[PDB]
Design an enzyme around this catalytic site. Structure first.
Site, PDB file in Angstrom:
ATOM      1  N   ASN A 205       0.651  21.702 -18.959  1.00  9.45           N
ATOM      2  CA  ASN A 205      -0.725  21.217 -19.060  1.00  9.45           C
ATOM      3  C   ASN A 205      -1.080  21.149 -20.541  1.00  9.45           C
ATOM      4  OD1 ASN A 205      -3.584  21.290 -19.509  1.00  9.45           O
ATOM      5  ND2 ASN A 205      -3.939  21.848 -17.374  1.00  9.45           N
TER       6      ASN A 205
ATOM      7  N   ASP B  27      -3.735  19.788 -22.052  1.00  2.77           N
ATOM      8  CA  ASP B  27      -5.162  19.820 -22.394  1.00  2.77           C
ATOM      9  C   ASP B  27      -5.534  18.721 -23.384  1.00  2.77           C
ATOM     10  OD1 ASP B  27      -7.833  20.800 -22.309  1.00  2.77           O
ATOM     11  OD2 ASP B  27      -7.464  21.927 -24.173  1.00  2.77           O
TER      12      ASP B  27
ATOM     13  N   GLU C 146      -3.275  17.088 -17.287  1.00  6.47           N
ATOM     14  CA  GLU C 146      -4.450  16.966 -18.143  1.00  6.47           C
ATOM     15  C   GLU C 146      -4.122  16.135 -19.378  1.00  6.47           C
ATOM     16  OE1 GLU C 146      -6.670  21.031 -17.964  1.00  6.47           O
ATOM     17  OE2 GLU C 146      -7.959  19.620 -19.043  1.00  6.47           O
TER      18      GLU C 146
ATOM     19  N   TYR D  68      -1.845  18.327 -10.844  1.00  4.13           N
ATOM     20  CA  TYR D  68      -2.953  18.957 -11.562  1.00  4.13           C
ATOM     21  C   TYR D  68      -4.049  19.201 -10.523  1.00  4.13           C
ATOM     22  CZ  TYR D  68      -6.894  19.668 -14.700  1.00  4.13           C
ATOM     23  OH  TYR D  68      -7.984  20.204 -15.337  1.00  4.13           O
TER      24      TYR D  68
ATOM     25  N   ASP E  41       0.149  22.538 -12.884  1.00  8.22           N
ATOM     26  CA  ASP E  41      -0.979  23.451 -12.971  1.00  8.22           C
ATOM     27  C   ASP E  41      -1.634  23.484 -11.600  1.00  8.22           C
ATOM     28  OD1 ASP E  41      -3.323  24.844 -13.430  1.00  8.22           O
ATOM     29  OD2 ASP E  41      -4.018  23.482 -14.989  1.00  8.22           O
TER      30      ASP E  41
ATOM     31  N   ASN F 228      -3.682  25.843 -10.705  1.00  7.91           N
ATOM     32  CA  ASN F 228      -5.056  26.268 -10.946  1.00  7.91           C
ATOM     33  C   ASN F 228      -5.447  27.421 -10.035  1.00  7.91           C
ATOM     34  OD1 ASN F 228      -8.416  25.275 -10.826  1.00  7.91           O
ATOM     35  ND2 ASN F 228      -7.309  25.711 -12.741  1.00  7.91           N
TER      36      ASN F 228
ATOM     37  N   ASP G 236       0.494  28.070 -13.745  1.00  8.67           N
ATOM     38  CA  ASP G 236       1.482  27.012 -13.783  1.00  8.67           C
ATOM     39  C   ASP G 236       2.750  27.548 -13.148  1.00  8.67           C
ATOM     40  OD1 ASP G 236       0.101  24.912 -15.746  1.00  8.67           O
ATOM     41  OD2 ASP G 236      -0.279  26.937 -16.527  1.00  8.67           O
TER      42      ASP G 236
ATOM     43  N   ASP H 186      -4.258  25.039 -24.274  1.00 10.08           N
ATOM     44  CA  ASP H 186      -4.585  26.375 -23.787  1.00 10.08           C
ATOM     45  C   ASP H 186      -3.657  26.829 -22.655  1.00 10.08           C
ATOM     46  OD1 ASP H 186      -5.691  24.529 -21.999  1.00 10.08           O
ATOM     47  OD2 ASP H 186      -7.715  25.393 -22.026  1.00 10.08           O
ATOM     48  N   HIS H 187      -2.696  25.996 -22.240  1.00 11.82           N
ATOM     49  CA  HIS H 187      -1.583  26.422 -21.399  1.00 11.82           C
ATOM     50  C   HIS H 187      -0.303  26.373 -22.217  1.00 11.82           C
ATOM     51  CE1 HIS H 187      -3.520  25.741 -17.270  1.00 11.82           C
ATOM     52  NE2 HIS H 187      -4.392  25.223 -18.117  1.00 11.82           N
TER      53      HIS H 187
HETATM   54 MG   LIG Z   1      -7.695  22.938 -18.681  1.00 14.30          MG
END
Ligand SMILES: [Mg+2]
Ligand SMILES: [Cl-]
Length: 276
Positions: free
Chosen positions: A26, A28, A54, A129, A168, A170, A241, A266-267
């Site tokens: 991911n 971002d 993302e 995602y 991801d 989530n 993830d 941020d991943h």
């Molecule tokens: Mg995110």
DNA sequence: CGACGGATCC
DNA sequence: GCTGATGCGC
DNA sequence: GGATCCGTCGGGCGCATCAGC
């Protein structure tokens, strides 16, 4: 506590050498990620297949560096039609897949840009995602309905080949999958509803969590840290993830990695090694 | 969403 | 064209 | 009275749009 991923195991438990390296990330924001050198890291990792989530980027806006990847020349992209700048997934492969499809049933009418399906010789790869439950859980019921449609879509795949699902998803499945389980039980990513949806996903398809299969009692192993409050430097994070595998693929599983040090989002990336 | 203030547990 | 504000979602 | 629970709050990121120039 800080975490150091163990060294790469490139041999299956029975001694067969890994033949397939899949990386999932991911990013971002794909355009930002490239400016933060994310593609330099991909080249050092040299995966056979790269799955991105993302991307936040329609296919016309993909930086040209992405066409300077001769070892990942087969590229498939998806972005949502109504809201560009959110979601977006991509799949890049050394070899060309037999089949590529998008969405979980009705993408031609609700172009959501969350799911790519790619069929190869020996297995089917899905990257996803998964929709976020949102601040204050305002979209939690939508996510529960999505989880159910996704489970049914994955169960109903026509092919008899084993399944690799990555990306991801989530949700931190269990308490060991995030730093602050108790304080996050009413936050997106760790509600009882999303946790149970993940459990149902493993039972219904059925699928195994590759990292947790190999490392069942290892704590502090995360793939996401909020940009806020320097969380990543303190390794206050969540495992969001995954590589989920059909049971028939477990004897082929050499390792499932968390690339904690790779920056740009941020991943962090995760990497799968299979002996196929 | 983690830091923080504040209440509760023995 | 370019910056920085705001809005939105993560 | 230290550890734990619980609710509230401020806000780092990326990208689209908008205002201004
Ligand atoms: Mg995110
Ligand atoms: Cl495409």
């Amino acid at each position: 506590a800080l975490y150091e991923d163990p060294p790469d195991q490139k041999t299956s438990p029975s001694g067969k050498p890994a033949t397939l390296k899949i990386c999932s990330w991911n990013v971002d924001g794909l355009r930002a990620w490239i400016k933060k050198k994310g593609l330099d890291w991909v080249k050092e990792e040299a995966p056979d297949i790269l799955c991105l989530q993302e991307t936040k980027c329609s296919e016309n806006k993909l930086p040209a560096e992405l066409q300077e990847l001769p070892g990942l020349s087969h590229q498939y992209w998806s972005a949502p039609s109504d809201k560009e700048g959110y979601s977006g997934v991509g799949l890049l492969s050394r070899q060309c897949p037999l089949k590529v499809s998008y969405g979980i049933g009705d993408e031609e009418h609700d172009q959501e840009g969350r799911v790519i399906v790619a069929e190869f010789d020996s297995f089917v790869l899905v990257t996803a995602y998964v929709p976020n439950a949102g601040r204050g859980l305002v979209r939690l019921e939508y996510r529960q309905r999505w989880d159910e449609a996704f489970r049914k879509f994955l169960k109903g795949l026509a092919s008899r080949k084993p399944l690799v699902l990555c990306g991801d998803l989530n949700v931190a499945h269990e308490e060991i999958d995030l730093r602050n389980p108790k304080g996050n039980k009413k936050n997106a990513g760790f509600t009882p509803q999303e946790c149970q949806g993940f459990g149902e996903l493993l039972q219904a398809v059925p699928l195994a969590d590759s990292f947790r299969h190999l490392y069942p009692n290892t704590p502090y192993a995360y793939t996401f840290w909020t940009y806020m409050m320097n969380a990543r430097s303190k390794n206050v994070g969540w495992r969001l993830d995954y590589f989920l595998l059909s049971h028939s693929l477990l004897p082929a599983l050499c390792d499932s990695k968390i690339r904690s040090k790779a920056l740009g989002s941020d991943h962090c990336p995760i990497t799968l090694y299979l002996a196929l």
